[PDB]
């Protein structure tokens, strides 16, 4: 990913990141939390480039959902169930009413 960033190929950055973080998403593993802090850096430090490409908007929407799903499983795996509910509500992927 840092090499693909060095040549500004941001579609592939989002493609790799979503592919490795989805397979890891629910896991209690060092690679999951290390890749999640790296993803929180890719957010802060590059999002203005990652959202401006003419491809990969869905790959960014997925990145901006996975970086919230990791934050939801962070709270579920740490008994913070009321804060976890508020993360998945404000993710809009589930229905709250009929």
């Amino acid at each position: 990913i840092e090499f693909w960033i060095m040549i500004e190929e941001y579609p592939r950055v989002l493609e790799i990141y979503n592919s490795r973080i989805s397979v890891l998403l629910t896991s209690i593993s060092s690679e999951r939390d290390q890749l999640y802090q790296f993803g929180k850096q890719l957010f802060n430090d590059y999002q203005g480039r990652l959202k401006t490409t003419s491809t990969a908007r869905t790959s960014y929407l997925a990145f901006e959902q996975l970086l919230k799903l990791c934050d939801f499983f962070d709270l579920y795996n740490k008994e913070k169930y009321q804060e976890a509910i508020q993360k998945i509500e404000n993710l809009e992927i589930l229905p709250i009413s009929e």
Partner: protein, 920 residues
Amino acid sequence: PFNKEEDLKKIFLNSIESIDSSIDKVATIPDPTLKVLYKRDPGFNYFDGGSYFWSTLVIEKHIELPQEITNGYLSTSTKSLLGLFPEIGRAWISIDQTLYLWDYRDSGELISHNLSQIITNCALIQPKKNTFKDAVKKVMVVCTHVEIFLFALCYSNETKFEILSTLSIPSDNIFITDIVGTKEGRIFLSGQDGNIYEIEYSKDNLFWFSNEKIKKINLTQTFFNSFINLSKKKEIIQLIYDEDRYLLYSLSKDSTINVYSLGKIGDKFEHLKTIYPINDIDSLFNNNSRKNMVIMSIHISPKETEFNFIAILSSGERLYYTLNRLAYIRSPPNNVDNNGNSNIHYTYYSNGVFFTASEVSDQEDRLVGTTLFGNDIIKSHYETSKSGFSNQISQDTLSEKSNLFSIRGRVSVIKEDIVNDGKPTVYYKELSNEHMNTPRRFLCLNSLGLHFISKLRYVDLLQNILSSNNPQDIDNFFDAFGKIIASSLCISLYCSSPHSSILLHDQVYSGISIPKTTTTRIADLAMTFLRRKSGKPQYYQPVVIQQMFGDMGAPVNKTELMYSNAYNGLLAYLARVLYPLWNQSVVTSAGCSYWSIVQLQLFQSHLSNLLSFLDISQLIPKGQEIPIIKISSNEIYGEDEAIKNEKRSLIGLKNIIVKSIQILNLFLILSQYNFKQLFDSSSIELDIKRKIDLLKFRDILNSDILTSNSTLTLLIDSLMKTLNSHNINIDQVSNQLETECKENRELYKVKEKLNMVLRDGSTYFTDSLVKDSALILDSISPNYNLSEIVDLFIAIKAFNYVTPLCLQYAQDLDPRGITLIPSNNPSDEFKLKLSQKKSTFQEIIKLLNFIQSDNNNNNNNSGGGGGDNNNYNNTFEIIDIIIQQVLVCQDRLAHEMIYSWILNNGMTSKFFEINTPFIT
């Protein structure tokens, strides 16, 4: 002819006049009390929708009392009290002789302090200026039965402090009932004797014959009454200070109210009036339950209103006073019981919000909360009601929504919370700053914990009416507030949603955007109802109803344009986003900006999300040109031209949004690079610098339409020269100054670098400034004057870079190879490009003849020596390099020109050392 500059500049100016017209609506919103000041009779105008999503108050969280305080309640021997100090972000509780200060912000920090005497009351006041250490941000006043103490709250940061005791003075056995302060640091006390006292305290001794640094004075004991006890007074039960009118008020234990001036410097205590609310009421009810009534409380009416204070009855009946008269009466809502016997114990008011707590059981209070709810006033100030001559002579324009809660534990105090800076906006203008302000939080402290209670904004209450998913309540809202303002609130919800977010470059401006409190489902429900409520732009005639006094000639009535509810909602959103900017100067007479970086970013985020809204809403259909207006059937051409004028006015508004972003962005960049160092140094004339406090954001938006280098270009003029004079990278900052606010800038920086080499000479630094100057020219090719650049390289003798530069610039004059293909019918584009390439390769031939001429000038002067051989070698070796640099080029005309020069120098040997197809 038609002129597209004139048309765009007229569109832009008409959209500025449209924004002035909308911003003076945002400014001029009327005081609703002005209609009501002359109603004799009780007010009852309570708004409801029959649906709970219309609640103007919501409980945000509850937090229970810390276990030290709860075990304090299990050990209380005589007395408790509860209180609130948002003026430091703390609650306070006192249990007999112990005082607790508790953090209700998300640190939880408790601080306990013990006294040797039972506590009577406690309050927090601003210190007298120059009187303590400057780290003493507040003074806490604690009364007991025997003494009164002044604690200096001395600060180590913004959230934590020392409780330093500094001064005490006896009570004289005067039980103190209430305690109030001023922004000069005056301190008033009320006694159970019915006197008002003040604390003369000072840093250094009050009188030159004494050691007093604290002293108590009675301010309402006239010098004869000490010798003639001609009745007691009443106990006083409340004190209030109206800072904004410079008035003290005091409420007495028979409902008698007294008013005193403190003077416009805090200079005085000067009694003005006694008011007798029960007599003032019975006077009205004899000029058109009750015999048990008392006034419970007094509260302030905002400075901007003709009302000065409110007094509140033991019935929920509110009494609105001018200093002259009782001027309106307001009944409770029917959420207070029809039996007319509710135990109302606590009553609070701040700036168009009102609360009553009333006891229901030994463990529960009913909290009734009302807000002034501006819907008819908001609607009739934006929408001209076509229902002419409505007889508004009896309509009570103080509309309130009433809300209802049950609360476990006895409500002991209420305050408003300090979630907003500078001043609270007066209730009938909350709408004007709604998008800049947080919701108006209240704090309700009771015998179990602290309830946090927000007043909803009209945007937040629309979000709840949309989350109801009820199409009828959303239709009710659009016709209750008006389609212009409901459209403005749908646009606000879209600006608060994820999908409106055009990002800023976080790599320079880190994270500060509008908090995204609105979900996608709510944002595009709001967009769907905005589309459904929009309508078309249409012409109308104003029906000027003639008064029946004769013909003498009528006027010709015009046709006039109604824009859509989407256009008017956009213009009523944009005017509120720009309201704090538009009428204000950007630069202080101190030489600094008027706004902070955080404020500039929040205005930038509103305008970028609104720019996103214009290109996602499709109100400007992408790729359509400016509609060219000309100078059953006829009433098609009515909408045909109305839709052209809306599309014109929308393009004018978009251009003003974009330029408002460009101005905020330029003032953010100028803030980083020390704004005042750029302002004081700038090439701006001294009598312009003496008037920049008079130059508004509005007037800067106009300034480039009327070279006249504008004030903005003359700050870029000092930024660029400040970066140069510190050797800072000027190009990182410029890529931002061209994405947010190429060739023409960089052609000057090439000329600037080459004018350092022509000043300082050839060295590894200045010879890099030559490498850098080539690569920058190539990065802007062919958009420069080649011959003027070639004479700079020739004046440096940096010859080796001129051949590549004259070849690349010749390629970028024809990046289609059109001059490479011989045509028996040449285009005039081909003739032009062929002449341009022949003029650029003529600079290589200018260089080669210059080098050959320098060689010949020196050989005509070395007339008696030997050693010149190396100078002769190196000169021909540079010529062979310049030849080979062209022989690599696929352009035949470069080749035929070099071959013509080799032949005209007689250098026929070199054709035997070349192989390229054009030689044959």
